[PDB]
């Protein structure tokens, strides 16, 4: 009633252990952070597993089947034959 804290007439130790409504919200957020450890951990674990499949795919994309080059060397266009020879004459 009258022992309720006052920001002016406050002790240092009491402010350190206040634990008001602001902290009550944070403690509820922390309850979710902890409960999400397996869901988040499962995602990162898959990123670590997916990491090794990506390494082999990059080499497959750059070097190809027999180390002579993969689809990294392929480039395609939508230009017609007239558009290409127009650009050359434009150059």
């Amino acid at each position: 009633p009258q022992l309720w804290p006052n920001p002016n007439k406050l002790r240092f130790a009491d402010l350190y252990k206040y634990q008001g409504v602001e902290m009550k919200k944070i403690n509820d957020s922390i309850k979710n952070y902890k409960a999400a450890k397996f869901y988040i951990g499962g995602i990162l674990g898959g990123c670590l597993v997916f990491k090794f499949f990506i390494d082999a795919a990059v080499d497959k994309y750059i070097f190809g089947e027999n180390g002579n080059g993969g689809k990294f060397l392929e480039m395609q266009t939508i230009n017609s034959n007239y558009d290409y020879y127009y650009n050359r004459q434009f150059q």
């Binding site: 939508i78 290409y84 150059q91």
Partner: protein, 123 residues
Amino acid sequence: FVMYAFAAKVLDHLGNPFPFSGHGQIVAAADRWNHWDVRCYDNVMKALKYIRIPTVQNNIPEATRWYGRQPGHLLRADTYWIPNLVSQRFAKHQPAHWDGTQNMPIFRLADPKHKDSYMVQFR
């Protein structure tokens, strides 16, 4: 007052407090790795290094103007022009077989007078 002092520490580097107004200023050390990934580009060297002296015939050097007209490459992919947003959905991407050059115009060209770039505003 504290945040006013902290902002003063930052503004010695950032300079202008308003956004979209200017750039910060940081003096860095000079080493062989300055601009190491753009040494291949010539226009970047001229812009950084050379301050050219204007002549009586007040014009940009003819060589600089001539090099500037060699059109750059501009992607065909365009969702900003509604005719291409529709037409490019039915377009067939065919392989562009390398002919041994470095200037194959497999896309459109960044020139206002190009028949596939006239809708683009060059200002």
